[PDB]
Amino acid sequence: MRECISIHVGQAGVQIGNACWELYCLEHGIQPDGQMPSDKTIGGGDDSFNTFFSETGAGKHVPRAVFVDLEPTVIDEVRTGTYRQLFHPEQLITGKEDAANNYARGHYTIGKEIIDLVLDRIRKLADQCTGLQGFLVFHSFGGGTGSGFTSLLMERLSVDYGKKSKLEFSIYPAPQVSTAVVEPYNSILTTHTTLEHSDCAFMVDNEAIYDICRRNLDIERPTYTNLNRLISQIVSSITASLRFDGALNVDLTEFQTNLVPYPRIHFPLATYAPVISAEKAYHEQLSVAEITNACFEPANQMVKCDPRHGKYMACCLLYRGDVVPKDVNAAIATIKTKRSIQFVDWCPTGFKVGINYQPPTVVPGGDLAKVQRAVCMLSNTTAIAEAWARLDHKFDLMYAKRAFVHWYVGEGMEEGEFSEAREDMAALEKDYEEVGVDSV
Amino acid sequence: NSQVTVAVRVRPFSKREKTEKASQVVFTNGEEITVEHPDMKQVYSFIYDVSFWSFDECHPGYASQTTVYETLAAPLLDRAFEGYNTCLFAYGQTGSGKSYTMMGLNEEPGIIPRFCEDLFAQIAKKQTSEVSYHLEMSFFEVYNEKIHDLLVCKGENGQRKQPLRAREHPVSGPYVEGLSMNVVSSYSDIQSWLELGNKQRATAATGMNDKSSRSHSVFTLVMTQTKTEVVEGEEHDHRITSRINLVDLAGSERCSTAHSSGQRLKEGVSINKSLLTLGKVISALSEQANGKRVFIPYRESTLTWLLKESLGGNSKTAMIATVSPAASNIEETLSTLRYATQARLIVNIAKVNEDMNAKLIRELK
Amino acid sequence: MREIVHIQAGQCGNQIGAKFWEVISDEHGIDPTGSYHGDSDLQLERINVYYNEATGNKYVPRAILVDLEPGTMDSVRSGPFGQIFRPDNFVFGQSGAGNNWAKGHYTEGAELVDSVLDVVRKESESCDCLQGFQLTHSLGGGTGSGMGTLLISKIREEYPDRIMNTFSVMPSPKVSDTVVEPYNATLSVHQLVENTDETYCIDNEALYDICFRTLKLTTPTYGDLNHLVSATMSGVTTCLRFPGQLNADLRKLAVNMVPFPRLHFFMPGFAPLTSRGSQQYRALTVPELTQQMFDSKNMMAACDPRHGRYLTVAAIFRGRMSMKEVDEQMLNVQNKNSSYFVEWIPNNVKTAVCDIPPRGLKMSATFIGNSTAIQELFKRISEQFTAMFRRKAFLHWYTGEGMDEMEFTEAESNMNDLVSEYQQYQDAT
Ligand SMILES: CC(=O)O[C@H]1C(=O)[C@@]2(C)[C@H]([C@H](OC(=O)c3ccccc3)[C@]3(O)C[C@H](OC(=O)[C@H](O)[C@@H](NC(=O)c4ccccc4)c4ccccc4)C(C)=C1C3(C)C)[C@]1(OC(C)=O)CO[C@@H]1C[C@@H]2O
Ligand SMILES: Nc1nc2c(ncn2[C@@H]2O[C@H](COP(=O)(O)OP(=O)(O)OP(=O)(O)O)[C@@H](O)[C@H]2O)c(=O)[nH]1
Ligand SMILES: Nc1ncnc2c1ncn2[C@@H]1O[C@H](COP(=O)(O)OP(=O)(O)NP(=O)(O)O)[C@@H](O)[C@H]1O
Ligand SMILES: Nc1nc2c(ncn2[C@@H]2O[C@H](COP(=O)(O)OP(=O)(O)O)[C@@H](O)[C@H]2O)c(=O)[nH]1
Ligand SMILES: [Mg+2]
């Protein structure tokens, strides 16, 4: 059976893990105590689909996930919370301090003494798999553990495993909003190191979801328990092809090909069109044509980046529910007739389609509505350079005076590792420039 | 009024590298220096105020030891005898040739011996019945932001690294409390003291070498000129002093590739920090010389605080960064180059010089 | 796994500490018998930070009181919460400092600190993982400044990786309490600058105005003023004890607040404070906290940020809150008041939001600021200093105890250098 490993790192990933497994457990029919009475009443089945949940003899289904951190104060909401009887007690959480918004502290200093234990429990879950498809890493630029440890771990996995797809779901640092004065340093050092190892790193910006939650869902005072259910839907729309039956099923290796032309431009953006409240769930048709055009609407992009300042190199669409292909080809034709959507000349196709039959569910206590169709658009745009440059300029301003550097050197880091990283960040911005230029 | 003279020296291959046919990655175009990766992906360009291309004995402008001395160090003696303080910093990773340049062999001397002997010669020439000169010397080290002396005998103990303190005399600026100072009359005495001290300088067999320096060494010469002038009486006591400082810095070294725990890690951290503060002070000094209003953070590190009176003011600073041309040392090379740079790194990409023979484009034109 | 050693030096620390343990015990539900009478289970999950355990499920604080005048230490034992402290940690001597920095640093402190450090090593090695230290003392006197900074220098060499968070009552501009505050303070700053990571400057004049202008108190005593400092000391170390959405330890503040090593002096604050009557008129929302926090009158430092620029600030929130409402508001403060912020730091603010509010409140907030307005303290002391040292006004009570004219000048220059180190960023750029 086809399987995927879900690695969760730092506070930003763990709190998304709780939101993803709240959703996976609901769709298949699992209670928080690991049980699935459906097979007790039916007489067995693969409904507890083995891609994400492994099975024991007592009927308990354990998730294929690992929940790393350096703070105890985050995991201990899990070991004491609703889902304590689901996860293996091996959660790999360090009885020491955090990284204190420091790459050098998460990469080397207090990233070692832990990494070997993390890399074994990953090995144990992989030896239990009869054909592994890839990894799914959840972290956030801005911290030490989501920057450092994720750059330490992805290096070791490129050695031992090598050929398996290693995907990232990352919280891009926003331009105006931010919870740390040293997000840029921890972000530009990360891309220097992951860019050679990861294969496709989907990016989201917390600021865009804050706006998406205001315009559409009408939530003026959101929390992180509202952003992350909406992120949990992106991951499910990706991993649905491995779990449920469908007409066109897009595995992991197919995202890695259609969306990544050259090895260094694997930074696409995600979104989800039918963000509709219960009240506005009526008064809407919610057709493929209405849902599909909205994925290109800049307001509904989950990264603050106007696509109209750039060009699309590749775009993958993942439909769900009562979706008929003829309605999709009509849509993709309607998008190529427009002129605010300018593609590259070297990708006249541009598009990919995936269709499933299992509609999305509704996590109770939430805000999203019961819609019968859904879309997840994964786009590779040249616009995202404007975000790279905005971060680099923040880096060059406060690095010239060597502000906040001694906290990095004090954990083991050379001054030239900034500059080297800076050069790496100044290249990539030329590659996104060159590839977007029209050929002769 | 001041200005930092930055010089970069690219050594030649060694016999071992010539045997292994280690490739070349550092090139020259007159004054500019470049690094072209073996992967043919990026071309980094550096400019420095002075370059010393000791790669091939045949090329015009091959930097001899005398050329290096007469270009970088000797004007410091002119300013010293003029009555102004001087500092020469030496930086370079092990295997670059940081000692060959400074101290040198028995046959091909370096900056230290040429400097000291020329000093003695100029003194012997200027010595008369009216003017006299007096030379004192000291030799201390810095280790984990603590001071130690290099010219005492280790007592009968498991260790006698007796630390000392720094203090700010309101007039003479900062100084080191309890440091021994000795008088000198010849390079024999200077060489004897230095050869004693460099056995006590902290060194350990890291991964990169059997003997890599883990302390910042400071070698100070205080030169006092006693002259006389008519005061309607006994001409007496017109006194001038000048301080020469020769600093040997330690190498940076990252601790993420060079796995290293414990005392080695603490040493590397302190080295990295001191070098960072040194770079900040140097850039602040450059901006001050170019005329901006600048605050120089002398106090964020012991070396800067002790050398305050010999970098700022009407004082003359020089830095010599040593690099290797081989490809295996390329990370260290790029790091040292970036560190020695003061204005900006230049970057391009080019693979278009190979014009298939004899500049094909000419006949195309 | 993140434990703190509390140290209390002098008459200003030992009376704050007495209130500090009278505010944490009431949070974690501990009574003065050391026993637990709480309601939730969160109060005990991270009790290992400040308190240790004992036989009968009793909890003994990790406090180390130090002094040279027993009169203060004996006042604590007789107080309401005195009977929980470990009696072997009541370290004292005799022959008080006499408001002389020398006596508390050079003569009587040296003959006492070795007994103090034994208690520290005895507590530090009983901890699984040590975050840092927490000293509550006062400049202007002898014990807190002398014996405090002597103890800092020793712990920093012996425990160099760990944090030394300091809460310090600075001298006031108008109304002194000791005639030789400039001497006893300038020497203390010479030690704190080198040997600290984060120092919280408190000034009693600012606390009297907060008590009179906002709290509308007519007869405020020192126990009330300290009820404002005990609040900030807790808000800082909240996200170690209680869980939240975005957590922040002490180190996570220092990295985001100390851009250069020497500029670790902070202006604290606390929200929301109000009168016993005016609480029926003020809705507690996230915006109302943020305005009160950035208000010059609500800062405990006796300076005014509006004569300078914020280099970097911090807002440790406590309660159920919308993260958008926090991030929007901290953004709005910068884009409106950009002149009071630094251009070469793109965002001068961070955030931390905990989910367990205080004993009787829906939401609270702590504010920590690093501003160029803090130079007016050191420039003011540097003026009082040189006017006195130039004619040697009170100097013979120090030289007779093992000092010289040289150490006084070192204290002036490091302080006057730090002042200029702040002004460079205060100006146009
Ligand atoms: C029942 C009730 O709502 O009365 C309030 C009250 O009227 C006000 C005035 C309280 C009251 O504040 C004061 O009276 C006061 C006087 C001098 C100095 C400081 C405070 C109160 O004491 C404050 C006290 O709040 C707390 O108890 C916090 O938990 C506070 N408690 C203690 O520290 C404490 C001190 C001694 C003994 C036991 C507990 C706290 C603050 C920070 C961290 C932990 C705890 C409460 C609810 C009130 C009173 C009692 C009137 C407020 O207190 C604070 C910290 O702001 C002022 O605004 C809050 C809430 C109210 O406005
Ligand atoms: N989308 C989302 N982002 C979060 C959440 N919690 C924290 N973050 C993000 O995390 C970033 C700050 O860095 P952290 O993720 O806390 O750093 P870390 O990976 O946890 O490493 P440490 O901070 O040392 O524990 C900010 O950009 C936050 O937006 C969350 O629940 N959802
Ligand atoms: N300019 C030069 N021209 C020719 N040969 C040189 C030059 N500089 C250095 N060398 C050679 O390279 C060696 C480097 O110096 P040596 O002290 O032997 O090793 P080292 O690694 O440079 N010591 P260190 O730099 O302190 O780590 C010299 O001994 C010479 O043999
Ligand atoms: N805030 C506050 N300050 C105090 C208290 N007691 C003393 N002080 C301050 O302490 C200073 C005097 O220092 P002192 O404590 O006598 O020094 P010590 O004798 O060495 O401990 C004055 O500035 C007082 O304002 C108190 O209970 N609260
Ligand atoms: Mg954390």
Numbering used by the authors:
A (entry chain E): 1 to 440
B (entry chain N): 391 to 755
C (entry chain I): 1 to 429
Question: Which sentences did the original study use to describe this structure?
Answer:
KIF14 is a microtubule-based motor protein with essential roles during cell division. KIF14 belongs to the kinesin-3 family of motor proteins.
Construct K755 includes the neck-linker and part of the first coiled coil heptad repeat of the CC1 domain. The other four datasets correspond to KIF14 dimers forming a two-heads-bound intermediate with each of the two heads in a distinct conformation (MT-K755-ANP, MT-K755-AAF, MT-K772-ANP, and MT-K772-AAF). Different from the Apo and ADP states in the AMP-PNP and ADP-AlFx states, the MT-K755 and MT-K772 helically averaged cryo-EM maps show a density connecting the motor domains along a protofilament. This density can be well-fitted with the undocked neck-linker of a motor domain positioned further toward the microtubule plus end (leading head) and part of the coiled coil domain connecting with a docked neck-linker of a motor domain positioned more toward the microtubule minus end (trailing head). The neck-linkers connecting density and the combined densities in the motor domain in the helically averaged cryo-EM maps strongly suggests that the KIF14 dimer in the AMP-PNP and ADP-AlFx states binds to the microtubule in a two-heads-bound configuration with leading and trailing heads in distinct conformations. The structures of the leading and trailing heads of the MT-K755-ANP/AAF and MT-K772-ANP/AAF helically averaged cryo-EM maps were separated using the 3D refinement and classification procedure (HASRC). The MT-K755-ANP and MT-K772-ANP have AMP-PNP-associated densities in both the leading and trailing heads. Construct K755 does not include the full CC1 domain but includes part of the first heptad repeat. Our results then show that this incomplete heptad, although insufficient to induce dimerization in solution, is able to do so when many motor domains are bound in close proximity in the microtubule lattice.
